[PDB]
DNA sequence: ATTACCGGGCTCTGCCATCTTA
DNA sequence: TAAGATGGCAGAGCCCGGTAAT
């Protein structure tokens, strides 16, 4: 009865929430008020605390003690209620999306026992709050799959292959098993490849690869593939091209396509790009904005050195000054 | 004095489908 | 037998500067 009327007050987006979870709304106990106050009580604001209940409306549900104990696990991670506050504004579904503290805490525990550090705990739960929320046995499962992954290759030793991995790529435990393999299999397909250099492609440029969704890697690949062949690159051009810079595989098909053409236009060749492939680093405004100022020095393009397009603005802004 | 080489910083959902659970 | 709990999916870079090399 009085819920509709508190989540006016409070600044809920009431139609938003009752169309995510319905359930919610066909309860005849919620604590909303208990809620409002436990998280204005670690720092929330007022819209914050309507933004979380409107996305995640179940939130609502949840006992102070509950809350309570959930948060001072959470601090058991984190140093600070800010940062808690932080994280819960950009997904409150990894906090409200379980009501197992036990279960968190053996996640914890688990995690440890695999040789993560503290900071290492911090830096996931930080950036993907929803490996917290997985059951211990999804955990499990991934890291186990890691383990045999790493030894079913040359890895020395796996439990050292899985904390690299981890640190690297701290979203790999929230990514399923199957995306994983199918990510790792059109790497190992695509390119050549034995075990070592596969490995270290995995644990170093080509770490977070491992994470793109279904058929994405391949479709991407295919474009770059494509664009460059349509200018005169040879595959194995495009091969060492892509292995010396694997992060242009992230690039929407227009942005990388987009990013080429605006270089050449300029009369930049494709091959002075494939050849400082950092140069893609930089987003199309500030290569476009760059450009510009070059050119409208003295500047040639054709012959000049393009490494500066992708260097930091302060080391670029001072080769710019000397160049007029 | 200037560029290259290379790694690190920041990275933090919101939905639906399929079970459990009471 | 309806909610809650859980798994799994699409989504689609940019920038900085330490330190080696020249």
Redesign the pocket.
């Known amino acids: 009865e009085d819920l509709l009327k508190n989540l006016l007050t409070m600044g809920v987006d009431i139609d938003?929430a009752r169309?995510?979870?319905?359930?919610?709304?066909?309860?005849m106990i919620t604590n909303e008020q208990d809620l409002k106050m436990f998280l204005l009580s670690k720092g929330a604001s007022k819209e914050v605390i309507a933004?979380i209940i409107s996305?995640?409306?179940?939130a609502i549900?949840?006992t102070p003690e509950n809350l309570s104990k959930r948060w001072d696990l959470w601090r058991k991670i984190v140093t600070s209620d800010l940062?808690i506050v932080?994280?819960?504004?950009?997904?409150?579904?990894?906090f409200?999306?379980?009501?197992?503290n036990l279960?968190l805490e053996n996640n914890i525990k688990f995690l440890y026992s695999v040789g993560l550090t503290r900071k290492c705990l911090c830096?996931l739960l930080?950036?993907?709050?929803?490996t917290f929320?997985?059951?211990?046995?999804?955990?499990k499962?991934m890291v186990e799959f890691l383990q045999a992954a790493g030894l079913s290759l040359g890895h020395n030793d796996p439990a050292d292959f899985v904390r690299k991995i981890i640190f690297?790529?701290?979203?790999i435990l929230?990514?399923?098993?199957?995306?994983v393999k199918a990510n790792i299999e059109f790497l190992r397909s695509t390119f050549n490849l034995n075990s070592e250099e596969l490995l270290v492609l995995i644990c170093?440029?080509g770490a977070?690869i491992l994470?793109?969704?279904?058929?994405?890697?391949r479709?991407?690949y295919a474009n770059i593939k494509e664009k460059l062949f349509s200018l005169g690159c040879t595959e194995e051009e495009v091969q060492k091209f892509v292995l010396?810079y694997p992060?242009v595989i992230?690039?929407?098909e227009?942005?990388?396509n987009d990013?080429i053409d605006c270089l050449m236009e300029e009369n930049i060749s494709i091959s002075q790009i494939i050849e400082?492939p950092?140069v893609?680093?930089?987003?199309?405004?500030?290569?476009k904005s760059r450009i510009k100022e070059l050119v409208n020095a003295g500047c040639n393009l054709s012959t000049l050195?393009i490494?500066?397009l992708?260097?930091?603005?302060?080391?670029?802004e001072?080769?710019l000054k000397?160049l007029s």
């Open positions: 938003m169309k995510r979870q319905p359930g919610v709304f066909h309860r933004s996305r995640y409306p179940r549900t949840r940062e932080n994280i819960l504004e950009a997904s409150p579904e990894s409200f999306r379980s009501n197992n279960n830096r930080t950036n993907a709050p929803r929320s997985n059951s211990l046995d999804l955990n499962q690297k790529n701290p979203f929230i990514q399923s098993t199957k995306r170093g440029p977070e994470d793109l969704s279904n058929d994405y890697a479709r991407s010396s992060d992230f690039l929407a227009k942005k990388f990013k400082n950092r893609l680093d930089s987003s199309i405004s500030t290569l050195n490494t500066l992708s260097w930091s603005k302060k080391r670029y001072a080769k000397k």
